[PDB]
Amino acid sequence: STSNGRDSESKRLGAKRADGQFVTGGSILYRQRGTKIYPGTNVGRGGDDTLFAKTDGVVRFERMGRDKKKVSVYPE
Amino acid sequence: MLVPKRVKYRREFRGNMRGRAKGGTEVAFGEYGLQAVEASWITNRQIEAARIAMTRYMKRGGKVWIKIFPHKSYTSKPIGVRMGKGKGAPEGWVSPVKRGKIMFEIAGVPEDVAREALRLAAHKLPVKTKIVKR
Amino acid sequence: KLEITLKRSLIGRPQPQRKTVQALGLGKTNSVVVKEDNPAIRGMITKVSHLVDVKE
RNA sequence: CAAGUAGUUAGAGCCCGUUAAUGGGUGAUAGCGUGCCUUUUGUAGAAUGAACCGGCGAGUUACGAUUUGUUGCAAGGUUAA
RNA sequence: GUCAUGGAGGUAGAGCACUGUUUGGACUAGGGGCCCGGUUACCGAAUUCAGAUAAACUCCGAAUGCCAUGUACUUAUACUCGGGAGUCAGACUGCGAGUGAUAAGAUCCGUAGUCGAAAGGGAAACAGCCCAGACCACCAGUUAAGGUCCCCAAAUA
RNA sequence: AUAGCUCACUGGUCGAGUGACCCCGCGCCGAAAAUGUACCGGGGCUAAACAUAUUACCGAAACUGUGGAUGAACC
RNA sequence: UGGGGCGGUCGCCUCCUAAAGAGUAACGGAGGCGCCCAAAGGUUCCCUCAGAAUGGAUGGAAAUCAUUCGCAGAGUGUAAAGGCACAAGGGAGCUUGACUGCGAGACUGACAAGUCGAGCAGGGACGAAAGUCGGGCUUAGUGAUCCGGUGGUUCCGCAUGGAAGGGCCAUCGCUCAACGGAUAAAAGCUACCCCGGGGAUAACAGGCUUAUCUCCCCCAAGAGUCCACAUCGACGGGGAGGUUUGGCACCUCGAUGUCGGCUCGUCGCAUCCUGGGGCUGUAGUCGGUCCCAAGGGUUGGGCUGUUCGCCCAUUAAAGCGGCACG
RNA sequence: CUGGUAGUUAUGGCGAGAAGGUCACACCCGUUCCCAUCCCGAACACGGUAGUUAAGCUUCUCUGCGCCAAUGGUAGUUGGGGGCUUCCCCCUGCGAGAGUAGGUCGCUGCCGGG
Ligand SMILES: [Mg+2]
Ligand SMILES: [Mg+2]
Ligand SMILES: [Mg+2]
Ligand SMILES: [Mg+2]
Ligand SMILES: [Mg+2]
Ligand SMILES: [Mg+2]
Ligand SMILES: [Mg+2]
Ligand SMILES: [Mg+2]
Ligand SMILES: [Mg+2]
Ligand SMILES: [Mg+2]
Ligand SMILES: [Mg+2]
Ligand SMILES: [Mg+2]
Ligand SMILES: [Mg+2]
Ligand SMILES: [Mg+2]
Ligand SMILES: [Mg+2]
Ligand SMILES: [Mg+2]
Ligand SMILES: [Mg+2]
Ligand SMILES: [Mg+2]
Ligand SMILES: [Mg+2]
Ligand SMILES: [Mg+2]
Ligand SMILES: [Mg+2]
Ligand SMILES: [Mg+2]
Ligand SMILES: [Mg+2]
Ligand SMILES: [Mg+2]
Ligand SMILES: [Mg+2]
Ligand SMILES: [Mg+2]
Ligand SMILES: [Mg+2]
Ligand SMILES: [Mg+2]
Ligand SMILES: [Mg+2]
Ligand SMILES: [Mg+2]
Ligand SMILES: [Mg+2]
Ligand SMILES: [Mg+2]
Ligand SMILES: [Mg+2]
Ligand SMILES: [Mg+2]
Ligand SMILES: [Mg+2]
Ligand SMILES: [Mg+2]
Ligand SMILES: [Mg+2]
Ligand SMILES: [Mg+2]
Ligand SMILES: [Mg+2]
Ligand SMILES: [Mg+2]
Ligand SMILES: [Mg+2]
Ligand SMILES: [Mg+2]
Ligand SMILES: [Mg+2]
Ligand SMILES: [Mg+2]
Ligand SMILES: [Mg+2]
Ligand SMILES: [Mg+2]
Ligand SMILES: [Mg+2]
Ligand SMILES: [Mg+2]
Ligand SMILES: [Mg+2]
Ligand SMILES: [Mg+2]
Ligand SMILES: [Mg+2]
Ligand SMILES: [Mg+2]
Ligand SMILES: [Mg+2]
Ligand SMILES: [Mg+2]
Ligand SMILES: [Mg+2]
Ligand SMILES: [Mg+2]
Ligand SMILES: [Mg+2]
Ligand SMILES: [Mg+2]
Ligand SMILES: [Mg+2]
Ligand SMILES: [Mg+2]
Ligand SMILES: [Mg+2]
Ligand SMILES: [Mg+2]
Ligand SMILES: [Mg+2]
Ligand SMILES: [Mg+2]
Ligand SMILES: [Mg+2]
Ligand SMILES: [Mg+2]
Ligand SMILES: [Mg+2]
Incomplete structure (x- = not known):
């Protein structure tokens, strides 16, 4: 009876900083499997595909061509 | 009786029947139709009886x-069985029909034999119904 | 200027309702305040328009 | 001739006279009103306890720790046997 | 709290562009027969025309909710350190789902309210429904839900 | 079966409306249980029911009026 | 744990539920893990899949070549999701960064733990250079402390010199899988049972529900020699009742006595008899079916604890149900 | 006018038709040399200009495929209020998907030659 019943635990993926927020260097901006958001300017892609800020600045969620997105950090 | 030849998943949610029919409100193939006025589940046995x-x-x-x-399937439990210990076993097939x-x-x-x-x-x-023309 | 009177009770109302009324400056029932005619004030009023009476 | 957790609010009639003040006793009639405790999501509860009255009957002391208040001295303070 | 601005996120809805399920028509490459390879409809895979369906489908995609910026207008908290707790049996009602039989005053989650810990007025009586929050005194007034023939205050409007 | 009635139809009397069909509002039947009317609280109601519109009044420990008590904040 | 037992499960990963941020339960719906690779890792250079159509064959539908169409219909060690054709997919050359000491700042989070990280120093691999490299397209592939074993060590060493023994760094020994692990070490019966509690939780009865059950209807193919509806009525559809088998766990565990029979009844009508009627496939006698009707009536025995049921002999008849199965 | 090199969601792509040139760029000719093919000077690399715009390229035309895209209405829905509650209705604000009017055979920057 009930051969099911197992599930993993949630990994708290998503966006950790908002557009237009001042951000300190080295802080995570988006946790995600694969590449839903590409790294833009002054951000880098981590080992498990997270995006982090490589310098202090203001977060900007921008758009590449038709069906892709990217996030970048601009010094004030 | 109409039954799908294969199903990806054996068990399914029951769903709901809110709103008007998404599509099929207008007669297109023949020139006389039987339109549903309210929402109900129609099983394949009723479809077979009506067609006959x-x-x-x-x-x-x-x-x-x-x-x-009848895409959707429904399950049921026997008598004397308590609540719990999984879901029941499938028994039939239904087609949730929305109003309109x-x-x-x-x-x-002609008119007479079609209407009758x-x-x-x-x-x-x-389900309460009414007769429509094209 | 415009006049705000709280005519309905807050018992049974969701939290945003109460927070908006409490931010408008109204206390007990049948209480009156006088504000200005900003877009922000009217934005508050349209949210709790069923609890309040507006006058100039 | 009356359907009552026994009271409370309104109230005539009759009888009194005080720590003297918009006083005392009883109350025809009218409105409203399902005891106290415990345990519970929830008890008038057809869940528990108590017949009634009286006495007795449950967070204390010693030695340590920590924090607040007060007093003395202050880069010092303080003795134990 | 609201306003203006900028974002991330695929629900409701819709759609068939992928994946399953599926109806009618033409052609079906064929299989089996009646046969002398034809007749094929007894089934016909692919293609195409049209029409449907989906919690574990998506070429699309809201309302709300969420994260920020502000110098905008209101409004009174928020945070850190330390002393003291109690709580870890919840209930029903509205809405969104699962299990159940689209049963239960059922069970298990999300969201709001009330009870719990809340008396007062209305539902005859009535924890959870509607109105509304009791500092005390008054033989004063205006209203809420609900009401105005008699019990029973107010329209035989 | 032939029978009896009689249809389609015609000829007359007659003198003015007569047919089906669709939609909406309110009603009727379908309608059965155990102590006693017992599925308006009662009496009772043909409005004292229902629909739309209007105006008065009643109605809470709510809000106000008068007099007292008290907590916090700030002067 | 929709009472306990029997059955199943206990830690980790992926999707739906999950209500467009994160999170979110059920003995809800589906699957995987307790590894593998010395290249299936690093770097430099290069290129591109599945399938179909035609051409010939040993060889056929499918083996290997040739031309065309071909945005991914392939592949990506392995389950699913997210992603990837400027490869993260496929070949070749050289190699071991599958490095040592670290780490501003963040995510997750009760704690213990878990995750990402620019950049700094030492010393390298590939590359002309820019530059990339602290394992694998990304997320599972793993368990604390205590105690022992092995290697190293400008640490201590109970009068002094040594030693025994310890400390520090690196690493090994768990299906401690009941996977935050009670111990180095552990199964059953109780109807002879006892104490503390609970209506937080079951057996009877009540309550809610009505799947099932009893009863009543709708449509009408048909049977009825013809003729759907005298009488039955298939395939399907709609309700009432609260007598059955169930579901739930709301009152009762500081006690609500259980089946059958006896005594005594009372109520409902869905009427067994008697009374009054309509239709008949009602000649008469006897019947079938429906309608009104609750006034009275409704047997004695054999078998079984039996309710029930079968049987014997009667009768106008030998009704069905409720009342804590009165 | 052309060659080279960037930005911009295809309004920029795909397809069909026409024209032009060794000034540039191409196709082209050859393998001694640097270099290369699991074989092949096909490609990569090197060395030259006999021939030709047939192809790339460049320019010009289109709506055939594709892509973009209104207005109006509708579905849905935050807040408030009611029913006969598998669900439905009313008021206010927001407001899609499909379909369509229509647009599209690109638009900008720098360098060198002509
Ligand atoms: Mg997960
Ligand atoms: Mg990596
Ligand atoms: Mg890794
Ligand atoms: Mg009398
Ligand atoms: Mg008397
Ligand atoms: Mg007196
Ligand atoms: Mg309590
Ligand atoms: Mg209880
Ligand atoms: Mg009593
Ligand atoms: Mg007790
Ligand atoms: Mg007692
Ligand atoms: Mg103590
Ligand atoms: Mg001091
Ligand atoms: Mg949908
Ligand atoms: Mg504190
Ligand atoms: Mg807990
Ligand atoms: Mg709990
Ligand atoms: Mg709860
Ligand atoms: Mg549901
Ligand atoms: Mg419920
Ligand atoms: Mg409950
Ligand atoms: Mg409260
Ligand atoms: Mg109350
Ligand atoms: Mg009350
Ligand atoms: Mg009531
Ligand atoms: Mg009352
Ligand atoms: Mg108060
Ligand atoms: Mg008044
Ligand atoms: Mg009766
Ligand atoms: Mg007050
Ligand atoms: Mg005062
Ligand atoms: Mg979410
Ligand atoms: Mg959400
Ligand atoms: Mg398993
Ligand atoms: Mg690989
Ligand atoms: Mg590769
Ligand atoms: Mg680094
Ligand atoms: Mg170095
Ligand atoms: Mg280095
Ligand atoms: Mg070198
Ligand atoms: Mg131990
Ligand atoms: Mg020594
Ligand atoms: Mg296992
Ligand atoms: Mg854990
Ligand atoms: Mg030992
Ligand atoms: Mg005992
Ligand atoms: Mg209980
Ligand atoms: Mg038992
Ligand atoms: Mg018993
Ligand atoms: Mg029971
Ligand atoms: Mg009882
Ligand atoms: Mg029922
Ligand atoms: Mg027949
Ligand atoms: Mg039947
Ligand atoms: Mg029962
Ligand atoms: Mg419960
Ligand atoms: Mg008991
Ligand atoms: Mg007792
Ligand atoms: Mg009868
Ligand atoms: Mg009779
Ligand atoms: Mg008779
Ligand atoms: Mg009788
Ligand atoms: Mg004998
Ligand atoms: Mg009886
Ligand atoms: Mg009894
Ligand atoms: Mg009994
Ligand atoms: Mg549109």
Whole structure:
């Protein structure tokens, strides 16, 4: 009876900083499997595909061509 | 009786029947229709009975269209069984029909026999209906 | 200027309702305040328009 | 001739006279009103306890720790046997 | 709290562009027969025309909710350190789902309210429904839900 | 079966409306249980029911009026 | 744990539920893990899949070549999701960064733990250079402390010199899988049972529900020699009742006595008899079916604890149900 | 006018038709040399200009495929209020998907030659 019943635990993926927020260097901006958001300017892609800020600045969620997105950090 | 040849998943949610019919509100193939006025589940047994009654009256003249199919399956539990310990075993197939949906069409027969055949069929279904033209 | 009177009770109302009324400056029932005619004030009023009476 | 957790609010009639003040006793009639405790999501509860009255009957002391208040001295303070 | 601005996120809805399920028509490459390879409809895979369906489908996609910026207008908290707790049996009602039989005053989650810990007025009586929050005194007034023939205050409007 | 009635139809009397069909509002039947009317609280109601519109009044420990008590914040 | 037992499960990963941020339960719906690779890792250079159509064959539908169409219909060690054709997919050359000491700042989070990380120093691999490299397209592939074993060590060493023994760094020994692990070490019967509690939780009865059950209807193919509706009525559809088998766990565990029979009844009508009627496939006698009707009536025995049921002999008849199965 | 090199969601792509040139760029000719093919000077690399715009390229025309895209209405829905509650209705604000009017055979920057 009930051969099911197992599930993993949630990994708290998503966006950790908002557009237009001042951000300190080295802080995570988006946790995600694969590449839903590409790294833009002054951000880098981590080992498990997270995006982090490589310098202090203001977060900007921008758009590449038709069906892709990217996030970048601009010094004030 | 109409039953799907294969299913990806054996068990399914029951769903709901809010709102008007998404599509099929207008008769397209034949020139007489049997339109649902309210929402209800239609099983394949009722569809078979209605089709048999509709066809027998016309003396197998004209043509019949069935505009619904029992995609969804429903489960049930035996008597004397408590709540819990999994889901039941599937028993039948249903087609959730929303109001405004046309589910039967007839062509090739005059007014009188078409109207009477639709009236005969409508008494086998658990949903209030009405007869429409094209 | 415009006049705000709280005519309905707050018992049974969701939290945003109460927070908006409490931010408008209204206390007990049948209480009156006088504000200005900003877009922000009217934005508050349209949210709790069923609890309040507006006058100039 | 009356359907009552026994009271409370309104109230005539009759009888009194105080720590003297918009006083005392009883109350025809009218409105409203399902005891106390415990345990519970929830008890008038057809869940528990108590017949009634009286006496007795449950967070204390010693030695350590920590924090607040007060007093003395202050880069010092303080003795134990 | 609201306003203006900028974002991330695929629900409701819709749609068939992928994946499953599926109806009618033409052609079906064929299989089996009636046969002398034809007749094929007894089934016909691919293609195409049209019409449907989906919690574990998506070419699309809201309302709300969420994260920020502000110098905008209101409004009174928020945070850190330390002393003291109690709580870890919840209930029903509205809405969104699962299990159940689209049963239960059922069970298990999300969201709001009330009870719990809340008296007062209305539902005859009535924890959870509607109105509304009791500092005390008054033989004063205006209203809420609900009402105005008699019990029973107010329209035989 | 032939029978009896009689249809389609015609000829007359007659003198003005007569047919089906669709939609909406309110009603009727379908309608059965155990102590006693017992599925308006009662009496009772043909409005004292229902629909739309209007105006008065009643109605809470709510809000106000008068007099007292008290907590916090700030002067 | 929709009472306990029997059955199943206990830690980790992926999807739906999950209500467009994160999170979110059920003995809800589906699957995987307790590894593998010395290249299936690093770097430099290069290129592109599945399938179909035609051409010939040993060889056929499918083996290997040739031309065309071909946005991914392939592949990506392995389950699913997210992603990837500027490859993260496929070949070749050289190699071991599958490095040592670290780490501003963040995510997750009760704690213990878990995750990402620019950049700094030492010393390298590939590359002309820019530059990339602290394992694998990304997320599972793993368990604390205590105690022992092995290697190293400008640490201590109970009068002094040594030693025994310890400390520090690196690493090994768990299906401690009941996977935050009670111990180095552990199964059953109780009807002879006892104490503390609970209506937080079951057996009877009540309550809610009505799947099932009893009863009543709708449509009408048909049977009835013809004739759907005298009488039955298939395939389907709609309700009432609260007598059955169930579901739930709301009152009762500081006690609400259980089946059958006896005594005594009372109520409902869905009427067994008697009374009054309509239709008949009602000649008469006898019947069938429906309608009004609760006034009275409704047997004695054999078998079984039996309710029930079968049987014997009667009768106008030998009704069905409720009342804590009165 | 052309060659080279960037930005911009295809309004920029795909397809069909026409024209032009060794000034540039191409196709082209050859393998001694640097270099290369699991074989092949096909490609990569090197060395030259006999021939030709047939192809790339460049320019010009289109709506055939594709892509973009209104207005109006509708579905849905935050807040408030009611029913006969598998669900439905009313008021206010927001407001899609499909369909369509229509647009599109690109638009900008720098360098060198002509
Ligand atoms: Mg997960
Ligand atoms: Mg990596
Ligand atoms: Mg890794
Ligand atoms: Mg009397
Ligand atoms: Mg008397
Ligand atoms: Mg007195
Ligand atoms: Mg409590
Ligand atoms: Mg209880
Ligand atoms: Mg009593
Ligand atoms: Mg007790
Ligand atoms: Mg007692
Ligand atoms: Mg103590
Ligand atoms: Mg001091
Ligand atoms: Mg949908
Ligand atoms: Mg504190
Ligand atoms: Mg807990
Ligand atoms: Mg709990
Ligand atoms: Mg709860
Ligand atoms: Mg549901
Ligand atoms: Mg419920
Ligand atoms: Mg409950
Ligand atoms: Mg409260
Ligand atoms: Mg109250
Ligand atoms: Mg009350
Ligand atoms: Mg009531
Ligand atoms: Mg009352
Ligand atoms: Mg108060
Ligand atoms: Mg008044
Ligand atoms: Mg009676
Ligand atoms: Mg007050
Ligand atoms: Mg005062
Ligand atoms: Mg979410
Ligand atoms: Mg959400
Ligand atoms: Mg398993
Ligand atoms: Mg690989
Ligand atoms: Mg590769
Ligand atoms: Mg680094
Ligand atoms: Mg170095
Ligand atoms: Mg280095
Ligand atoms: Mg070198
Ligand atoms: Mg130990
Ligand atoms: Mg020594
Ligand atoms: Mg296992
Ligand atoms: Mg854990
Ligand atoms: Mg030992
Ligand atoms: Mg005991
Ligand atoms: Mg209970
Ligand atoms: Mg038992
Ligand atoms: Mg018992
Ligand atoms: Mg029971
Ligand atoms: Mg009882
Ligand atoms: Mg029922
Ligand atoms: Mg017949
Ligand atoms: Mg039947
Ligand atoms: Mg029962
Ligand atoms: Mg419960
Ligand atoms: Mg008991
Ligand atoms: Mg007792
Ligand atoms: Mg009767
Ligand atoms: Mg009779
Ligand atoms: Mg008779
Ligand atoms: Mg009787
Ligand atoms: Mg004998
Ligand atoms: Mg009886
Ligand atoms: Mg009894
Ligand atoms: Mg009994
Ligand atoms: Mg649009």
